[PDB]
């Protein structure tokens, strides 16, 4: 009885055939919304977090707060579940689309069903189903997050075909031993609100920092302890072609802004960053040591 | 109904190294502190006999000659594993329900199979690594045949004519002996060939007074191994000479316990010589010769009978042996089954 375990139950009675489809996921990651003990299967899995109008960002941000929990052993009307300790090795399962390689960093991401059918699901049971997150290697995961944000930047201008031709290519990732079509956040023309909520956060600093920062560069420039500020003011021109005596040699600056309103422009500058921050970084949930043959199970040391 | 008649499972064979006739080629010994040693050696000394010179010829002074053998080292390793699922039903029994006990009795036999599948493998690996070594000490027959033919003439380091004459037999013996049973099959020509092998084999330095001995005092020497398809022929053509016999094989490995005086020398300067206490008395007595040199002193006093085959070749009762029994169903290629390129 040395091992700690999280028990689970089933409201619906399982079919005997259904019990064997959990035994194919003995090592699969089974994220849990909150650490507990007894847990109903409705609480189990990512399926309870499914949303309609809400976009992909809601599924991912809640996943960061979820307590990842490896499957242990099915036992009749129960589900053993152990939450890994930091720094110990564990045999996880490569349910992810891309085959693992030894030593790769890993970070959990929500599953992304695409266009043409392939693998679908096995554990349907009364509306609710046991969806599982992908376990993509980290360097690929940075590429995935970059696509969904940029594909939403074009959501405003679907009307022209040349934009649609580009999003069609960004949709098709091309990496080792794999090709996939990451689903377009755009649907029913207008973008889902969670992406539009995030896309503004990039456009804020892309625009709000294009005026507010001009005042604070000139004052710090007097020190020149690092000398870079003399050139840093010319970094703000936002141009490619060389200037041709049009005389915009110095940046435009805000004019006679109210001292209270001036604080509000900065106070709101960072609250946008607090919303955007969730996509900026990916914790390394696992670090594989040596992949097992058949690219199924793989021993990994837990991290985080 | 879909009836299912009773299931079957194969019974394991019990191979052993000492029971095998390949063991006759080895003087097996146990030595628990083997991991520490780096290299072994055995120095030799040979002074040459000489004959009187005639008038008008240069004479020959006595010529001391000494040489030192070394010892190669190799290891072996067999993985085996138990699933943590089945492993945890071992010590961690639950409630004493009749269903729960079955997983305990099964897991306890999962370990007995996991060990004896490897414990049986450990014996076969000594059969395999030892035969693998002999192949590195097994020059092709036409090379050894040239030696016995012109060894006697070249008392000096070989002359440029002698080296050319040695090369001449390398080819003439290669074009005819390259295949045997595929070609000529005279019952006497095979016996005339195989009896020539035992004359070409130099004796091992240590001698065994009693181990591996035919009943009624016949002294066993030599051994050979082959695939069953070749031995199936040899049992027929030479049946007049082959006879079964209960060889007196040693019952247990020998041992090489360290002397207490060696324990100081192992630390003082990282070297050891066997039976160091024995050498001290022989210097004070002044006697040169010693009764034994450790390796023949390494135990193996026990002996047990077991049936074997032998042949009368040159009055040398060579052991016969077949390795088909120990390589069946194994996923490794049989070391005796090889191949030969011809340009």
């Amino acid at each position: 009885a040395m091992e700690a375990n999280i028990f689970c139950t089933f409201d619906h009675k399982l079919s005997i055939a259904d019990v064997g489809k959990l035994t194919k996921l003995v090592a699969a990651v089974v994220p849990i919304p909150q650490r507990l003990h007894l847990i109903k299967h409705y609480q189990l899995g990512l399926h309870q977090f499914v949303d309609h109008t809400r976009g992909y960002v809601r599924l991912r941000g809640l996943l960061r707060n979820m307590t990842l929990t490896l499957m242990r052993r099915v036992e009749g009307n129960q589900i053993l579940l152990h939450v890994p300790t930091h720094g110990l090795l564990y045999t996880v399962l490569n349910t992810g689309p891309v085959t693992w390689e030894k030593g790769d960093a890993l970070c959990v991401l929500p599953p992304l069903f695409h266009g043409p059918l392939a693998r679908e699901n096995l554990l349907t049971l009364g509306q609710w189903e046991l969806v599982l997150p992908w376990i993509v290697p980290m360097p690929l995961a940075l590429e995935i997050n970059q696509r969904l944000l940029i594909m939403g930047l074009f959501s405003l201008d679907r009307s022209y075909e040349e934009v649609k031709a580009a999003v069609q290519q960004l949709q098709t990732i091309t990496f080792r031993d794999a090709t996939f079509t990451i689903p377009d956040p755009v649907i029913d023309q207008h973008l889902l609100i969670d992406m539009k909520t995030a896309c503004l956060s990039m456009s804020m600093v892309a625009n709000l920092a294009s005026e507010l920062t001009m005042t604070y560069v000139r004052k710090l420039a007097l020190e020149d302890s690092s000398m870079l500020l003399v050139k840093c003011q010319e970094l703000l021109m936002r141009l490619d072609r060389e200037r041709s005596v049009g005389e915009p040699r110095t940046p435009a600056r805000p004019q006679h802004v109210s001292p209270d309103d001036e604080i509000a422009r900065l106070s709101a500058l960072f609250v946008m960053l607090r919303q955007l921050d969730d996509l900026i970084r990916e914790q390394v949930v696992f670090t594989v040591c040596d992949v097992s043959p058949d690219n199924k199970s793989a021993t990994c040391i837990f991290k985080g | 109904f879909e009836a299912i008649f009773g299931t079957f499972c194969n019974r394991l064979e019990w191979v052993y190294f000492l029971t095998s006739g390949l063991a006759a080629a080895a003087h097996a010994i146990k030595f628990h502190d083997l991991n520490k040693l780096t290299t072994g050696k055995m120095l030799f000394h040979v002074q040459v006999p000489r004959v009187a010179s005639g008038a008008g010829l240069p004479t020959s002074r006595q010529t001391t000659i000494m040489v030192t053998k070394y010892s190669e080292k190799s290891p072996i390793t067999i993985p085996f594993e138990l699933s943590a699922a089945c492993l945890t039903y071992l010590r961690e029994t639950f409630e004493g329900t009749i269903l729960d006990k079955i997983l305990n009795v099964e897991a306890m036999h999962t370990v007995l199979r996991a060990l004896k599948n490897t414990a049986d493998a450990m014996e076969r690996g000594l059969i395999h690594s030892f035969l693998q070594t002999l192949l590195r000490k097994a020059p092709p027959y036409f090379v050894v045949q040239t030696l016995v033919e012109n060894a006697t003439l070249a008392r000096q380091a070989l002359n440029r004519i002698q080296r050319s004459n040695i090369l001449q037999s390398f080819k003439a013996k290669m074009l005819a002996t390259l295949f045997l049973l595929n070609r000529t099959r005279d019952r006497d020509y095979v016996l005339k060939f195989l009896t020539r092998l035992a004359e070409a084999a130099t004796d091992s330095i240590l001698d065994n007074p009693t181990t591996y001995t035919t009943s009624s005092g016949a002294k066993i020497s030599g051994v050979m191994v082959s695939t069953a398809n070749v031995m199936q022929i040899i049992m027929s053509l030479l049946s007049s000479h082959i006879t079964k016999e209960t060889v007196s094989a040693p019952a247990t490995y020998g041992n090489f316990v360290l002397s207490p005086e060696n324990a100081v020398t192992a630390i003082s300067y990282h070297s050891i010589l066997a039976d160091f206490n024995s050498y001290k008395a022989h210097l004070t007595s002044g006697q040169p010769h010693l009764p034994n040199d450790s390796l023949s002193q390494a135990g193996a006093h026990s002996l047990t009978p077991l049936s074997m085959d032998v042949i009368r070749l040159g009055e040398k009762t060579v052991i016969m042996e077949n390795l088909r029994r120990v390589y069946k169903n194994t996923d490794t290629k049989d070391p005796l089954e090889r191949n030969v390129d011809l340009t």
């Binding site: - | 072994g40 053998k69 190799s74 290891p75 097994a138 020059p139 050319s164 295949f179 030969v340």
Partner: protein
């Protein structure tokens, strides 16, 4: 784990092996030549249109390897040759060497001899004498071994000849090539090895029991070089002699019928017909291996 320690207690050799009984032959005993285009992929014709006409005539593919892939291609090599869809016989090989039209075949092909056209046994050479050892195998002021004519095959015996730059492993190593393909002829041209191969007689055969054996993968169609260990080692008797074995061959179908119609001794004899000739067979495997089954 286990830690055995073998000890060479024998003064002279205490063990020996003699080849005995064939049961089968993996080799196709074929004729199709080695495709140098798969052995030296990087080589290309300078003119653009010419290469389009060459590969179309040879039938060889012209892959567009990426600059990344070419670098690993030149080092570890690869099994670039596609496996045949069906192989009733087995692995094929047939390395090619251009030679003189006026080769003295009567003094050469009738008996075993060096493919280089100048015999280069190292056992005949004085051990540890690199200067003399490299002279007899290359410099032609000295009389040749075996036949004493200085060189039957000037385009092969010479250092730097087309056979030497194309098949010596060090001259090949300077060129880009796929190491995994196995050329049987290369063993006769390893100047940086064969010149150092010479030793005292007993030490020579001891090295013959180690480095002399070559690996060949057993599941692939054509032969490929492989890492030693997992595959069974293959000793070559010719390495000790450096002299290749002649086989039966006929200039024309007519002379071939006389051999097939003859008795057991018919393969051993050689015959000629004006400018046509028939090489004899030194090892009567042809009658033996098929009849012996």
């Amino acid at each position: 784990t286990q830690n055995i320690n073998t000890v060479d207690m024998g003064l002279g050799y205490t063990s020996n092996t003699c080849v005995a009984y064939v049961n089968r032959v993996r080799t196709d005993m074929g004729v199709r030549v080695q495709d140098l285009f798969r052995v030296f992929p990087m080589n290309v014709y300078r003119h653009d249109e010419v290469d389009r006409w060459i590969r179309h005539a040879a039938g060889v593919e012209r892959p567009q390897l990426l600059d990344t892939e070419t670098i690993s291609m030149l080092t570890f090599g690869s099994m670039s040759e596609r496996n045949a869809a069906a192989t009733v016989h087995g692995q094929k090989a047939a390395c090619e060497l251009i030679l003189t039209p006026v080769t003295m075949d009567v003094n050469y092909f009738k008996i075993p001899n060096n493919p280089r056209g100048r015999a280069s046994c190292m056992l005949a050479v004085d051990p540890y004498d690199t200067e003399a050892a490299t002279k007899a195998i290359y410099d032609h002021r000295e009389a040749d071994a075996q036949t004493f004519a200085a060189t039957h095959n000037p385009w092969a015996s010479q250092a730097g000849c087309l056979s030497d730059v194309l098949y010596n492993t060090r001259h090949r190593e300077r060129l880009g090539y796929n190491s995994k393909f196995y050329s049987p002829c290369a063993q006769y041209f390893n100047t940086e090895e064969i010149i150092a191969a010479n030793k005292t007689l007993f030490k020579t055969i001891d090295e013959y029991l180690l480095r002399a054996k070559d690996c060949i993968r057993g599941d692939t169609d054509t032969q490929y070089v492989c890492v030693e260990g997992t595959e069974q080692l293959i000793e070559n008797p010719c390495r000790l002699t450096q002299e290749a074995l002649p086989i039966l061959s006929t200039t024309t179908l007519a002379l071939m019928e006389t051999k097939l119609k003859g008795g057991a001794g018919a393969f051993a004899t050689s015959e000629t017909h004006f400018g046509n000739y028939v090489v004899g067979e030194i090892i009567p495997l042809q009658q033996s291996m098929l009849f012996n089954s």
